[PDB]
């Protein structure tokens, strides 16, 4: 099926992706405040399927390592969320056999939402406390089925976001990993044999986010 390659060595944390995702689905805004960071919303929620995480780390000499992480469902090749959900009710989590998209349906309101979330190694699923429906990135699967890029990939200005067939994206990830490693010796691909959203991190993925990798 399909794959994202997310090269965080090019991300300006412009948040085009965060706003693109809400525009495409006409999602509402959360009520946010500044608690001493550009980061907002502070977390994924029922109505926020992607947010850019901001971490400040040290480096030698002038400046900082400013670490940007646009977080989304990884679309696991073998999704634990689906395994957990199938225990209660099949049809709640399905797989697009053509695109690889892992897709939540309305039947998620019938399963143990907190156990679906806890089965996710990346802590991605979010519950609506009112309806008990789960939500997350759906890979813009309808746009992909009609030959379009996901909203967040088309919007990206820097070449950070990349999408296409698993072979071309794995060949991209490897090429780009070897270049970035020259100027960033700790660069690594996130769980690249296991997920369809492959992040290139410029250092220890845990510095970007505690649930960056499995």
């Amino acid at each position: 099926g399909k794959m994202f390659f997310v090269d965080l060595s090019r991300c300006t944390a412009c948040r085009g992706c965060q706003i693109a995702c809400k525009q495409w689905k006409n999602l509402p805004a959360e009520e946010t405040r500044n608690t001493g960071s550009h980061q907002n919303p502070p977390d994924l929620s029922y109505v926020t399927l992607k947010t850019v995480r901001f971490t400040e780390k040290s480096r030698k000499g002038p400046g900082i390592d400013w670490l940007f992480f646009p977080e989304q469902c990884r679309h696991c090749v073998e999704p634990p969320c689906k395994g957990q959900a199938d225990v209660d009710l099949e049809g709640a989590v399905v797989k697009d056999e053509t695109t690889g998209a892992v897709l939540f349906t309305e039947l998620t309101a019938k399963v143990d939402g907190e156990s679906v979330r806890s089965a996710c190694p990346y802590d991605i699923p979010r519950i609506d406390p009112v309806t008990k429906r789960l939500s997350k990135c759906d890979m813009c699967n309808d746009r992909v089925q009609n030959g379009l890029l996901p909203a967040c990939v088309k919007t990206c200005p820097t070449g950070t976001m990349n999408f296409g067939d698993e072979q071309e994206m794995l060949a991209l990830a490897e090429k780009r990993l070897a270049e970035v490693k020259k100027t960033y010796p700790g660069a690594v691909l996130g769980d690249p044999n296991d997920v369809r959203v492959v992040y290139l991190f410029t250092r220890d993925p845990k510095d970007f986010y505690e649930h960056a990798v499995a």
Binding site: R10, G16, A20, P62, I64
Partner: protein, 974 residues
């Protein structure tokens, strides 16, 4: 296909936010009859290729926004309420107030008894946010009503860039274009946050790095740009000249200049008069009493024929290149380090990297904007960098240039259309009082007798004549000229500009203001002065998308509506996607955009609002007479209209211009009613009209060239991405300006691998050449009088070389370069005190933007996805400053200056560090100025409550980037 888009019509548009000029796809419901359903990037657009930053990606939320104005609202004097009214009521009453005010305030002749024919008591602010056709119609409407106090964004934005680059190169415009950044071998980003404020530009900057470029960011803060550069160096706000004068010295001392380029193309050889000197801060000819320089003391020595003398051996002691070496010999690493906060090591590293583009087959580029312009020394900051580029051979080449990044979508265009007090459309000066006839006007223009100097401005008579014949076509240029208002010849131009308009408003001298697509209650420096001043108006007309801090100043913080007599008309206008027209990007790309949805509710495009309002004024004059009604009765507005609406297409054609009569010009033959194919074929006799000469070429007999979407290129054009068949750029589709300097006298590229133009067969191939003529026969800088890149530039108020002066509010009592602490001829208002090394305001204050908000946030504060990302005013401080003041990350703090105070959330970060300035830690406080009292709840108010009303003596731009403040912890709340 996709349910969301299926039964919706697709149209193309251009982003209504920054001057990158990204392409949009708009989907409108029911094949164009319903509302927008989707907006996203245009994949075919050669600049963004479908990309949008979060402002572009949220345009749907702006256009389909139920907080938008729906109809006119009227605020009676001393009223606390808006009353809904009709357009018919709103535009008749406004016409009445305009006429009443014009009649009572019209100056036929001044004190000295010269003719001026100007309305004294009305001012207009706006707007860079309007389409190019609306801006030109708007200026002509206001000038026909006799206004001289005509200002917009440009005044408080890139105003210093126009004189700075004009003085250096001939023109004020960004020299290259966005796609051309990818060709650079060293991108210096300085006084710019381009990853945040021109985000799609970073596609091209990163593509430069992919092909071997080094990326350098020099900024007092570590920002989202800094995260993605190879080299970050801090610099203190207000210390750029020392950094850049350092680099001039480093280049000269180490022989890193491109010798051939300097000798032939710069005014390097030209000999300056013995009158020129410089002593302990001051150039020769300082009048202490009047704060002014006698510029005649700076003249070049003329040969016998009135041509500046040249020593092409570069030996004379008064060669410019030898006075340059002498002026900047003080700018040694240890003095620059000591005054910038930047270490010796870091200067050496950045200097070594940039200076290396010196080689003929290398190109370095500067990306700058407000971090350099918004200063008492803004013109001189930009001069210093222009000079470095000439020394290094970077002007005219692919991946070189001075990339002065323009702000709003059409600020390039609003400026082109003369919405500033000193200029008509096409940068022909507004006449002063001495210019009593067209002959006396046209005779201001300087002449060259150098046969190699094109001095192209000599054609001004043709453009002035074509301009008056666009306005007043049944008249002789010379007779129509009398219908247009004039400024006084004895007065500093800063008397007619933004800060002095507000000073005059604060003393009762204005009865009416048009705040047409601007929010000066938040955007103008010293916002508390402005808010009180607007209270002294009899009327104010606010044309905008939303109720805002300007429309409703009378119910702002600390105001009692019952005390305030101002009558306010709020007229709601339509968004970019609801009209057709053109916008000019930073690259001078004039791009055509189409309507998606119909205008929302009873909102109207600006062209229609201003055309209606003018007609009702002309009807009032036809019916009752009054003061000098001729300009108003005779203004040709029938060429602006079709099917009872404003016609952007017919206004564009008239701005391009056409022949009124058959004629012969350039020995070529033209029919009546035919479009002027180029400014080359315009005439001084009345054969041709053209609203804007720079537009001659935009709309020819071949159709609307701004509407071309053709990515076709030759292989030489494709190597540097000119896209010469994508839309149209002025002048005549010259994509890279000064491209004659990119070749030798043979016409061979300095960088064959990245060629702009080449002499091949008997043709210039590549870009359109910037000036006609065989290789070697003309000086490359055709808009200059002498034809050269000016290292020495004597028309500037502070002197013909940059020299460091501290900001008007500064942390130092003493300037290490001279006994002159401040700019000796700085624009200041008597009685406005300045925190100079004052313990009560010990920290450097600066203001800047974030990616997610726009200007005063009048637009983006209404957009729930952008408020979600950046909900409220914040304050960036170092950990060191936070320790001194006991401030914790996330605490509420109060930032104050002499002028005002506001609260903000503290962001304590290592991204700000103290500045070791002459051995003393100096702390900085950063604020974003995107916030205002009206919306959202708890967003905060404007950083302009802190800023000073003082600035650059050339342009009067306020010093919003370097002032002095205190910050304290706030202890309030449950």
């Amino acid at each position: 296909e996709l349910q969301k888009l299926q039964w919706a019509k697709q149209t193309t548009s251009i982003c209504c936010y920054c001057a990158v000029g990204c392409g949009l796809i708009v989907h409108t419901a029911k094949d164009g009859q319903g509302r927008a359903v989707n907006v996203e990037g245009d994949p075919d657009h050669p600049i963004n290729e479908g990309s949008l930053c979060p402002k572009g990606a949220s345009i749907f939320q702006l256009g389909e926004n139920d907080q938008r104005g729906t109809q006119p609202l009227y605020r009676a004097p001393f009223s606390d309420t808006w009353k809904p009214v009709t357009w018919d009521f709103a535009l008749t009453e406004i016409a009445k107030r305009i006429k009443k005010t014009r009649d009572a305030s019209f100056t036929e002749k001044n004190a000295a008894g010269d003719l001026v024919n100007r309305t004294e008591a009305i001012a207009s602010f706006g707007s860079a946010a309007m389409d190019n056709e609306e801006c030109w119609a708007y200026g002509n409407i206001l000038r026909s009503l006799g206004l001289v106090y005509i200002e917009h964004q440009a005044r408080i934005x890139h105003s210093p860039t126009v004189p700075a680059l004009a003085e250096s190169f001939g023109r004020g415009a960004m020299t290259n274009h966005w796609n051309d950044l990818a060709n650079s071998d060293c991108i210096l980003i300085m006084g710019s946050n381009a990853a945040e404020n021109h985000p799609i530009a970073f596609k091209w900057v990163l593509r430069a790095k992919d092909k071997g470029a080094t990326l350098i960011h020099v900024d007092p803060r570590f920002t989202r740009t800094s995260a993605r550069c190879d080299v970050y160096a801090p610099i203190r706000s207000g210390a750029d000249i020392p950094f850049l004068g350092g680099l001039i010295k480093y280049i000269l001392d180490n022989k890193l200049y491109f010798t051939d380029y300097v000798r032939e193309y710069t005014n390097a050889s030209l000999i300056v008069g013995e009158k020129f000197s410089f002593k302990d801060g001051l150039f020769s000819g300082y009048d202490a009493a009047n704060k002014k320089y006698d510029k005649s003391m700076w003249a070049f020595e003329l040969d016998a024929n009135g041509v500046p003398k040249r020593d092409p051996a570069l030996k004379h002691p008064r060669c410019v290149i030898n006075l340059l070496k002498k002026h900047y010999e003080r700018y040694n690493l240890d003095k620059v380090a000591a005054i910038t906060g930047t270490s010796k090591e870091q200067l050496q590293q950045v200097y070594k990297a940039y200076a290396a583009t010196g080689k003929p087959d290398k190109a370095g580029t500067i990306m700058y904007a407000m971090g350099w312009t918004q200063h008492s020394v803004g013109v001189q900051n930009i001069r210093a960098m222009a000079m470095i580029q000439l020394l290094l051979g970077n002007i005219g080449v692919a991946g070189g240039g001075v990339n002065a990044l323009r702000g709003e979508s059409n600020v390039q265009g609003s400026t082109d259309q003369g919405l500033l007090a000193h200029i008509w459309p096409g940068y022909n000066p507004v006449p002063n009082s001495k210019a009593a006839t067209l002959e006396l006007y046209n005779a201001a223009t300087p002449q060259s007798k150098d046969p190699m100097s094109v001095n192209w401005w000599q054609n001004r008579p043709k453009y002035v004549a074509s301009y008056l014949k666009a306005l007043y076509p049944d008249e002789e240029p010379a007779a129509a000229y009398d219908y247009l208002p004039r400024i006084d010849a004895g007065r500093k131009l800063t008397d007619y500009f933004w800060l002095n308009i507000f000073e005059k408003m604060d003393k009762g001298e204005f009865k009416g203001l048009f705040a047409w697509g601007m929010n000066p209650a938040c955007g103008g420096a010293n916002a508390n002065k402005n808010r009180k001043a607007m209270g002294k108006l009899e009327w104010l007309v606010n044309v905008n998308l939303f109720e805002n801090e300007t429309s409703s100043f009378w119910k702002g913080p600390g105001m009692n509506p019952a005390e305030i007599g101002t009558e306010v008309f709020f007229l709601p206008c339509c968004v970019s996607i609801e009209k057709e027209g053109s916008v000019a990007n930073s690259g001078r790309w004039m791009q055509w955009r189409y309507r998606g949805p119909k205008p929302y509710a009873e909102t109207k495009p600006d062209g229609d609002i201003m055309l209606d309002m003018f007609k009702k004024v002309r009807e009032l004059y036809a019916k009752e007479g009054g003061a000098y009604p001729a300009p108003i009765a005779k203004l040709n507005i029938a060429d602006w209209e079709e099917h009872n609406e404003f016609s952007p297409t017919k206004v564009a054609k008239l701005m391009n211009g056409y022949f009124l009569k058959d004629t012969e010009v350039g020995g070529k033959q033209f029919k009546k009613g035919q479009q002027v194919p180029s400014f080359a074929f315009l005439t001084a006799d009345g054969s041709t009209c053209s609203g804007n000469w720079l537009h001659a070429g935009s709309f020819t007999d071949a159709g609307n060239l701004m509407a071309r979407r053709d990515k076709t290129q030759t292989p030489e054009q494709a190597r540097i991405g000119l896209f010469p068949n994508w839309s149209f750029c002025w002048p005549v589709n010259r994509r890279i300006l000064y491209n004659r300097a990119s070749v030798d006298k043979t016409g061979k590229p300095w960088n064959p691998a990245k060629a702009v133009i080449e002499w091949k067969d008997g043709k210039w191939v590549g870009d359109v050449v910037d000036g006609g003529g065989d290789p070697g026969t003309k000086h490359p800088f055709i808009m200059q009088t002498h034809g050269f890149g000016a290292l020495y530039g004597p028309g500037r108020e502070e002197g013909p070389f940059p020299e460091h002066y501290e900001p008007l509010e500064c942390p130092v009592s003493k300037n290490p370069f001279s006994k002159q602490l401040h700019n000796p001829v700085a624009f200041q208002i008597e009685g406005e005190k300045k925190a100079v090394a004052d313990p009560r305001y010990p920290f450097i204050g600066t203001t800047y933007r974030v990616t997610e908000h726009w200007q005063t946030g009048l637009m983006t504060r209404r957009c729930a996805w952008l408020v979600e990302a950046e909900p409220q005013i914040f304050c960036e401080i170092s950990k060191e400053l936070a320790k001194l003041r006991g401030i914790g990350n996330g605490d509420t703090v109060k930032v104050s200056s002499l002028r005002g105070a506001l609260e903000a959330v503290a962001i304590v970060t290592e991204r700000i560090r103290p500045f070791k300035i002459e051995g003393v830690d100096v702390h900085m406080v950063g604020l974003p100025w995107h916030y205002g009292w009206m919306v959202p709840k708890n967003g905060g108010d404007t950083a302009n409550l802190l800023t000073p009303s003082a600035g650059d003596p050339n342009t009067g731009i306020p010093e919003t980037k370097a002032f002095m403040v205190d910050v304290r912890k706030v202890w309030s709340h449950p």
